[PDB]
Design a protein around this nucleic acid. Sequence first.
DNA 1: GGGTTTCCACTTATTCAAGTTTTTAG
DNA 2: CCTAAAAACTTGAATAAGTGGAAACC
Length: 293
Amino acid sequence: SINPWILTGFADAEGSFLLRIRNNNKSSVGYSTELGFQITLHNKDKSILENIQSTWKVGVIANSGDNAVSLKVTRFEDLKVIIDHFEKYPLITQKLGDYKLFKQAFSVMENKEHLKENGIKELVRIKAKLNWGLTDELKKAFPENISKERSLINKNIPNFKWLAGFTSGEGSFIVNLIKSKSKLGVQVQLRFTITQHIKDKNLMNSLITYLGCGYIVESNKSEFSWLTFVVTKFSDINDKIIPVFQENTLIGVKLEDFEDWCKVAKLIEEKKHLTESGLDEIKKIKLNMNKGR
DNA sequence: GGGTTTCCACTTATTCAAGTTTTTAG
DNA sequence: CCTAAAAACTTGAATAAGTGGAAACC
Ligand SMILES: [Ca+2]
Ligand SMILES: [Ca+2]
């Protein structure tokens, strides 16, 4: 049974809402619809999706390609569990807007309005602002569509449990070995990073004040830009980052990465990272986590 | 029924995580 | 001199988001 707030944090990172508007000759109005919430992780973290399934008691798990496994909740009556959960523990990223559109589509389908032409039209208005919006085909079939085009979400971190769930999806624990002019010739630097699209810049900046450390770094690969929350000072890592995730446990394979990460921190704290024997020990831990776990 | 729901195999763009190297700080 | 901290990126795939086909409920 996973924590309810750890779940929303994880959903804020890996979850997504789906609204299908498909042409269907067998449908009276000519369009079939599907509404649901899904998560797609690497096969290594299939354990998470099975704990979420037991926690919610809804959804179906199926392989998504050769290296991924998904958990999709399309059973309409099951969506009441999704809605019930996200009302008590709401999302805080821009995905909350997707959820809000998700509820609107839900009410339209609950009243069976999606089986008449009017309901389909309102679904096209809802889907126009959801995720990547309307497809070229949909946009051509409904050229006279309009709507509010969604409002911007601006919330901040609720509690630590949400952070543990969000870090379990977007966090990264790195042991950076730097070719240094030190006696050993190798500096051991611990780095904790959270990466998120620039759409949630305000939430990313709040990490510094919320955690009392770190800095924001923007990057970009041509037309795409993202933000990274970085913590490299050991005192902040050993006194701020580590304690938070010890009391607020992570989930998935990243908990194993975080555990080896703390092992290296124990060596640094004892200053054994400056001994040739200690440096060799940290080099072995890095290989055990770069490959897996 | 057969219109509508539900589920499973599968595809695709990019937002992520993971990684290395060089420079400045103290 | 020397160790820590930050800078400044690069990389490719685990994501998010989506599509195709169809069994089978109610
Ligand atoms: Ca995400
Ligand atoms: Ca992840």
